[PDB]
């Protein structure tokens, strides 16, 4: 966690339901967006920190 | 593995989204449709609804 | 000499051009644009914004 890894996502298309339908996740707290609503949207860039 | 459920390790991922006053490069799965002109229409251009 | 009449035009322009600029203020909401909130949040979340 002191040196977290970031993946850039760009020039691409997604389906966030493949994530939000999964029971595998113990938490899925979205801020400034609804998870169900993500499939209506587009973004300049997305960053996936881990 | 003897640690309690709060003391155990968790994997964490943070999806960060940005939509500037600049064109999109990532989108959801929704399929496009034909353009219509001079009629009154509801629209969604890249999340500009 | 007609400053009295042009002042009446100026004050109504200053009033309306302030009333219209206040549409762009957030007041602590996620966006000044009502269609962003309705494109991004579900009913129970969006009504609070």
Give the span between the Cα atoms of B27 and B24, in whole angstroms.
7
CA distance A6 to A47: 7
A33 to chain C, closest Cα gap in Å: 5
Tokens of C42: 């579900």
**What is the C-alpha to C-alpha distance for residues A16 and A20, in angstroms, rounded to an integer?**
6
User: Could you tell me the resolution of this structure in angstroms?
Assistant: 3.2
Q: Which residues contact A45 (CB under 8 A, 6 or more apart)?
A: A8, A9, A10, B18, B25, B26
- Residue B18 β-bridge partners: A45
Contacts B21 to C, Cβ<8 Å: none
Q: Which spans in chain B are helix H? A: none
The beta strands (E) that lie in C1-49 are given as: none
B10: left (phi over 0), alpha (psi -120 to 50) or beta: beta
> Which chain C residues are within 8 Å of A32, Cβ to Cβ?
30, 40
Q: How far apart are CA B13 and CA A2, in angstroms?
A: 14
Query: Contact partners of B by the rule of 3+ C-beta pairs under 8 A?
Result: A, C
Asked if B21 reaches chain A (Cβ–Cβ under 8 Å), the answer is no
């Amino acid at each position: 966690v002191y040196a977290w890894n970031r993946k850039r996502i760009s020039n691409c298309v997604a389906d966030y339901s493949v994530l939000y339908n999964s029971a595998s996740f113990s938490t899925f707290k979205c801020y400034g967006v609804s998870p169900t609503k993500l499939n209506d949207l587009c973004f300049t860039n997305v960053y996936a920190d881990s | 593995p003897t640690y309690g459920v709060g003391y155990q390790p968790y994997r964490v991922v943070v999806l960060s989204f940005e939509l500037l006053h600049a064109p999109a490069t990532v989108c959801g799965p929704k399929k496009s449709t034909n353009l219509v002109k001079n009629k009154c229409v509801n629209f969604n251009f890249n999340g500009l609804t | 000499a007609l400053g009295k009449l042009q002042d009446v035009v100026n004050q109504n322009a200053q009033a309306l051009n302030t009333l219209v600029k206040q549409l762009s203020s957030n007041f602590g909401a996620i966006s000044s644009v009502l269609n962003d909130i309705l494109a991004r949040l579900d009913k129970v979340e969006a009504e609070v914004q």
